[PDB]
Ligand binder design. Sequence first.
Ligand SMILES: Nc1ncnc2c1ncn2[C@@H]1O[C@H](COP(=O)(O)OP(=O)(O)OP(=O)(O)O)[C@@H](O)[C@H]1O
Length: 135
Amino acid sequence: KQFHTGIEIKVWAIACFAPQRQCTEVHLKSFTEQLRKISRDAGMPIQGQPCFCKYAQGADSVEPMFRHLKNTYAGLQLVVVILPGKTPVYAEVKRVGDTVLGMATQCVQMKNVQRTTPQTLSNLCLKINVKLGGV
Ligand SMILES: Nc1ncnc2c1ncn2[C@@H]1O[C@H](COP(=O)(O)OP(=O)(O)OP(=O)(O)O)[C@@H](O)[C@H]1O
């Protein structure tokens, strides 16, 4: 697909389903700041401060959390969801956002939050662009 211009992501949340002890708050902060700079540079600025950033465990936590987000944050544009490898959490996130609450979500692997590369950040930006782009 081609790149879309005129996306700005102002209202967004992080849900971290990776354990804190593996993916710590400095990991999250760091990853978010790198994401902030590459997306800005590509013309699709995601604001550096998510409206929400919490850790959760289990697919059972997903639906309560997302209903929480929907009910708390007007204008919420995106949930970025951090996953510890392979996990039923992925399917549940997609179930709830895609088919129940109509919430855009973008999943990301814990290893790519612990240690970012330009290429994986780009991959993410490109996926975000497609989702929030309107074409
Ligand atoms: N079964 C799974 N368990 C854990 N993580 C997964 C699983 N399937 C995919 N992922 C992770 O989700 C990330 C991308 O999720 P994303 O939100 O982009 O899905 P999607 O946009 O619905 O995919 P598609 O573009 O094919 O529809 C990838 O980095 C991948 O590692």
